[PDB]
């Protein structure tokens, strides 16, 4: 809490006056981003409260990734569709191993029996294998030479069935109230206003300090949007059952996969530019690996001191690879 | 039963006179195919009875996919080796998720505890991972630039060890009798005679209504040959233990993988044209995904109302992708 | 024991005088290699004794693959970096399925309940998925067009974190003594002296009897270095719990993945030539398959008469594919 208050209150004016100064561009992005972490850290706490207060699963789904959903909206109008696609990548990579890895590792003070074996396999994996592997992989391979008109039609079908299933499944499946109200202005508008700045910022930082443009989306942009907002997980270690921690990471990721991207892909239509679900091989091999890692660890659990270390390593390895490109 | 009687009795004369009329080609294929569904629906019931009556596992293996084995024989003489390879693809895709997906979904009236956990993992997965991943994937990657003479030699080795293992493993591992007799004439000859028509038909439908040639093999042709014959599975929901239903789908698929294709690959030798086990990337990524899906779901079970919905979605997604190519 | 004594005592003088004769080259490699099998069979027994006598896990890690580590050192100075990379491949392929496959199959006299279910999943798979899939796959995809300077930097990072984790994890995690002493001279010097011969030998056998150069590394070279040394596993069937047998195969392989290669990659720096972790697609698809196979079988166990047969088949299939290239 303490640190986060400082960053919201210091970040917004600096970001505002920074937008008024207009230069230098490189330092301000740096400032722009920093605020949003904290802004998403609140965004996350505000949703968690509302979800605790059936259909609140929509709020957890939409507004729980609203900073992901939002930074990617205006990147879509000014799209820059590439950044959108790189950022969706980063969302899955971010929860795994990063949020999950940080959770497992930090709360590796003392090992906690063996849980939750009967739950995870049945629900988490299937869609997770199903969602990612179907959703993203199929588009990539099939779209090689189709070409364009076919690409988006496939995406539309996939996207539409993903939501139509997600809604079909979901719908059939501390200190609250004040936070549920204050979120929108403190975040959803400030985040949306700082957003407008971010895209214009990127080309310039990409030309001045590279590389690369894709890296920005994949590591930095995701760190801010998804990780920070979902960082709730790490905190709930030992003090409460890490049951919820794996739920938060994978449930959120599933939602990215089955909801964020598909809706966002839909959105791409109403503006002239169109994003089909096309990923780079380095992006896709990275995603399926994380499913495999998650799956490997998820078998018995509950967690180990280096259950997280293994994960964090894998993620930081992928980050440095993504930077080198 | 009721519907199937209508389609056999109406389909065969139409198909015969259609073969006599010789035109238009497009409509008749359409008619040709329709009959065979029903013809394979009987083909399947006739084998199931015989299997119920040790070595009856050969009958279940051979004649249980005889319509797959058969439509692909004359496509091999007139091969058109491509269609053969696309159809083998469709067989695995068809059982998964389609037959398995339809079974799981339809019998999702009320959930049935958690089964069969100790059986499935040990037997179904290993060969399934082993069979598909080894059988098909290895050929594809290794065959990139070998070239030709090497391709088939690898296939021969793989094919031969697959049978030699399958026979080695298998051999060491209602209303009957009348159906066991009537099958051959009612089906194996009629199916074989309608077959002769099918191949000649495809180029024309492929040139008039496309696309594509591969699609025909992958979705339509498989629907008819394998799915229909194996559709037994869907029916046995709730009324009987779905134990057999997962057995039918995966056992059949394993047999395709370890038997149908390998024998069929062997056959390719005695005619001049030769098919090595070469698949397109879109075909192969689709197959391994289905193993992964099957594996994901297979962990605990027993099944969910949307255990099937997830599957059916994935399959229909792959079908529309395969059509777009 | 009996056979191995004959091969050490006959192999070394022949190899020495062979090195003095200098011709013909093809037959001597053949002789060179044969000795080393036996030399590594001792190398293995000498380490197993020392390990039985905390930090002895380093000896098991280093000297347990010292013939792999060593044949690849001088191939690195004279590198020929390709052979190094093909040989690391062969190490994982060798343990799986070959050592593991031979163990499972040979001790398939009578099936031994269902073990060891709770152990294997938690530890063996995660790193195994993590180690191989991260370690090797990531480098391959990401390194496509980086190019060179980036390649090795990624490798360095990966390599360094792999050891830094492996040491971090490991360190936190019959007839002895005389063998622990005699090993070095009988093997580590003789093996090192026969090594000097091996590399110079390969081009010539590769030009006279091909193919291919990669094959040499992938099948032959690995058979000798890793399999022979680790062949301890096969022997401990029934007489003792096959607990250790799966431990030997996978623990060794994990060590290859997390230690052998990374250290060896490091070594590549001090000489002018540099090996980044770059694999061919046929090499990599082969490795991940073996993880998948291992994983598939590892689910319940304990083993079946043809649990090994399935494996041995897959391996021999990969060997013939690797030869055809």
Coordinates of C-alpha atoms in Angstrom, one line a residue, chain C residues 23-151:
Chain C
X23 CA 46.0 -46.7 -41.2
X24 CA 43.5 -47.6 -42.4
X25 CA 41.5 -44.9 -40.6
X26 CA 38.0 -46.4 -40.9
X27 CA 38.7 -49.7 -39.1
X28 CA 40.5 -48.0 -36.2
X29 CA 37.8 -45.5 -35.4
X30 CA 35.7 -48.7 -35.3
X31 CA 38.3 -50.1 -32.9
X32 CA 38.7 -46.8 -31.0
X33 CA 35.0 -46.6 -30.3
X34 CA 34.6 -50.2 -29.1
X35 CA 37.1 -49.8 -26.3
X36 CA 35.5 -46.6 -25.0
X37 CA 32.1 -48.3 -24.5
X38 CA 34.0 -50.6 -22.0
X39 CA 36.0 -47.6 -20.7
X40 CA 32.8 -45.7 -20.0
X41 CA 31.2 -48.9 -18.5
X42 CA 34.0 -48.7 -15.9
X43 CA 33.8 -44.8 -15.7
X44 CA 30.2 -45.3 -14.7
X45 CA 30.8 -48.0 -12.0
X46 CA 33.7 -45.9 -10.6
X47 CA 31.4 -42.8 -10.1
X48 CA 28.5 -44.9 -8.7
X49 CA 30.8 -46.1 -6.0
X50 CA 32.0 -42.6 -5.2
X51 CA 28.5 -41.3 -5.1
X52 CA 27.5 -44.0 -2.7
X53 CA 30.6 -43.1 -0.6
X54 CA 26.0 -34.3 -0.9
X55 CA 28.9 -33.0 -3.0
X56 CA 29.4 -36.5 -4.4
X57 CA 26.5 -35.3 -6.6
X58 CA 29.0 -33.1 -8.4
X59 CA 31.1 -36.2 -9.2
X60 CA 28.0 -38.0 -10.4
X61 CA 27.2 -34.9 -12.5
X62 CA 30.7 -34.2 -13.9
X63 CA 32.5 -37.5 -14.1
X64 CA 29.3 -39.4 -14.7
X65 CA 29.3 -37.7 -18.1
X66 CA 33.1 -37.1 -18.3
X67 CA 33.4 -39.2 -21.5
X68 CA 30.6 -37.1 -23.0
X69 CA 32.2 -34.0 -21.5
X70 CA 35.7 -35.1 -22.7
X71 CA 35.1 -36.3 -26.3
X72 CA 33.4 -33.0 -26.8
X73 CA 36.2 -30.9 -25.4
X74 CA 38.7 -31.7 -28.0
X75 CA 36.0 -31.7 -30.6
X76 CA 35.5 -28.1 -29.4
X77 CA 39.2 -27.2 -29.8
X78 CA 39.2 -28.8 -33.2
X79 CA 35.5 -28.0 -33.3
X80 CA 33.7 -29.1 -35.2
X81 CA 31.2 -27.4 -32.9
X82 CA 28.4 -29.3 -34.9
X83 CA 29.5 -32.7 -33.5
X84 CA 29.4 -31.3 -30.0
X85 CA 25.8 -30.1 -30.5
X86 CA 24.8 -33.4 -32.2
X87 CA 26.3 -35.4 -29.2
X88 CA 24.4 -33.4 -26.6
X89 CA 21.3 -34.3 -28.5
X90 CA 22.3 -38.0 -28.4
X91 CA 22.8 -37.9 -24.6
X92 CA 19.1 -37.1 -23.9
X93 CA 17.9 -39.5 -26.7
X94 CA 20.3 -42.1 -25.3
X95 CA 19.1 -42.1 -21.7
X96 CA 15.6 -42.0 -22.8
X97 CA 14.4 -44.2 -24.4
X98 CA 17.5 -46.4 -24.9
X99 CA 18.8 -46.8 -21.4
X100 CA 15.3 -46.3 -19.9
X101 CA 13.8 -48.4 -22.7
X102 CA 16.3 -51.2 -22.3
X103 CA 15.8 -51.1 -18.5
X104 CA 12.0 -51.2 -18.8
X105 CA 12.0 -53.9 -21.5
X106 CA 14.7 -56.3 -20.1
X107 CA 13.1 -56.3 -16.6
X108 CA 9.7 -57.0 -18.1
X109 CA 9.8 -60.6 -16.8
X110 CA 7.0 -59.9 -14.4
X111 CA 5.2 -56.6 -13.8
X112 CA 5.8 -54.8 -10.5
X113 CA 2.7 -53.1 -9.1
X114 CA 2.4 -49.3 -9.8
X115 CA 5.3 -47.1 -8.8
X116 CA 6.7 -44.5 -8.3
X117 CA 3.7 -42.2 -8.9
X118 CA 4.1 -39.4 -6.3
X119 CA 7.8 -38.9 -6.8
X120 CA 8.4 -38.7 -10.5
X121 CA 5.7 -36.1 -11.6
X122 CA 6.8 -33.4 -9.1
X123 CA 10.6 -33.4 -9.7
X124 CA 11.5 -35.3 -12.9
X125 CA 9.1 -33.7 -15.4
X126 CA 9.2 -30.0 -14.5
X127 CA 12.9 -29.4 -14.9
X128 CA 12.7 -32.0 -17.6
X129 CA 10.1 -30.0 -19.5
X130 CA 11.7 -26.9 -18.1
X131 CA 15.3 -27.9 -18.8
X132 CA 15.1 -29.3 -22.3
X133 CA 12.2 -27.2 -23.6
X134 CA 13.6 -24.0 -22.2
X135 CA 17.3 -24.8 -22.6
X136 CA 17.3 -26.1 -26.2
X137 CA 14.0 -25.0 -27.9
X138 CA 14.2 -21.3 -26.9
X139 CA 17.8 -20.9 -28.3
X140 CA 16.8 -22.6 -31.6
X141 CA 13.7 -20.5 -32.4
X142 CA 14.9 -17.2 -31.1
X143 CA 18.3 -17.6 -32.8
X144 CA 16.9 -17.8 -36.3
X145 CA 18.0 -14.3 -37.4
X146 CA 19.6 -12.4 -34.6
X147 CA 22.3 -13.0 -35.6
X148 CA 25.7 -14.3 -34.3
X149 CA 26.7 -12.0 -31.5
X150 CA 23.2 -12.3 -30.0
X151 CA 23.1 -16.1 -30.4

